[PDB]
């Protein structure tokens, strides 16, 4: 059962990586590409949240 503790820590580092690898977007494209990069980021953050939630609940289920 020593593995399941390291597994959860490994799992959290991945979730942490996921978020860190989706950084807030740089303003360029005058409200058009700026709104596109904004929309894109929000979509991805929703996904990162739902994957985290699902990964994590296997460790507290």
């Amino acid at each position, epitope marked *: 059962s020593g593995d*399941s503790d390291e*597994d*959860l820590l*490994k*799992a959290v*580092r*991945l979730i942490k*990586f996921l978020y860190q*690898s989706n950084p807030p977007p740089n303003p360029e494209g005058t409200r058009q590409a700026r709104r596109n990069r904004r929309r894109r980021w929000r979509e991805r953050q929703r*996904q990162i949240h739902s*994957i985290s939630e*699902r*990964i994590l609940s*296997t*460790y507290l*289920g």
Partner: single-chain antibody
Framework: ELVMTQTPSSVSEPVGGTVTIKCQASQSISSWLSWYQQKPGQPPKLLIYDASNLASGVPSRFMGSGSGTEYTLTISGVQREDAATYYCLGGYPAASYRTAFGGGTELEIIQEQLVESGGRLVTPGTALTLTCKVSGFSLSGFWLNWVRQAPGKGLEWVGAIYRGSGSEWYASWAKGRFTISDTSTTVTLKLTSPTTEDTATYFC????????????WGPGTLVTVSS
């Protein structure tokens, strides 16, 4: 830890007849269930995703169902081109219970590129390195899985890597024995001390959505461990 109990072993059905393949998860996997069709000497092709969703190009005759823990693939108006071998894949690499394939059912009837190289005849003991070259992925980071298949046996999940980080995840049997590593346009699989029980075709599969299912597969590489 996760065990996909698949029934039946095999099914003989005439053209037009209804075909019902079932998977029973050992743990609550939820939407984490995908169905694959595999033809002789061919890598598996994705059919159904997130339990009920049909993959792009797949005909309507293939339906995916899921009631909590029990899962179902129905091929309704069966044709001669559906004579193949079907498997379910349940779970997630990063999940506590990992991701596992069902036994598989053999049915008889009456852009993104992945290439694995390095499959050779190693002598029992000899370290081996299988390398999966990755090209055309509009994706920076994603899961790159290693799936093996012993001659005339089912698909097994070796492990995966989240292409960005160093998040290596392996099956119970695989840990210690195997080592997945990341590079620029590549991902390797190292067999540290292989036995004859490691003779199989090794495939590298990509999860291009991060939802736990394999969309793109490689041709496969034949590994033989024999003196």
């Amino acid at each position: 830890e996760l065990v996909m109990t698949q029934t039946p072993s095999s099914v003989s059905e005439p053209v037009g007849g209804t075909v019902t393949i079932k998977c029973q998860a050992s743990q609550s996997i939820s939407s984490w269930l995908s169905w694959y069709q595999q033809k002789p000497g061919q890598p598996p092709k994705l059919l159904i995703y997130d339990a009920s969703n049909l993959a792009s190009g797949v005909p309507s005759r293939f339906m995916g169902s899921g009631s909590g823990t029990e899962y179902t693939l129905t091929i309704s108006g069966v044709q001669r081109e559906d004579a193949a071998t079907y498997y379910c894949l349940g779970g997630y690499p990063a999940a506590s219970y990992r991701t596992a394939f069902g036994g598989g059912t053999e049915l008889e009837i009456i852009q993104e590129q992945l290439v694995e190289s390095g499959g050779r005849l190693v002598t029992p003991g000899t370290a081996l390195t299988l390398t999966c070259k990755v090209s055309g992925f509009s994706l920076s980071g994603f899961w790159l899985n290693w799936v093996r298949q012993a001659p005339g046996k089912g698909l097994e999940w070796v492990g995966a890597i989240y292409r960005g980080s160093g998040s290596e995840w392996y099956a119970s049997w695989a840990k210690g024995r195997f080592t997945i590593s990341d590079t620029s346009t590549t991902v390797t699989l190292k067999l540290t001390s292989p036995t004859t029980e490691d003779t199989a075709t090794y495939f590298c599969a990509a999860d291009t959505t991060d939802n736990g299912y394999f969309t793109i597969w490689g041709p496969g590489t034949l590994v033989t461990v024999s003196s």
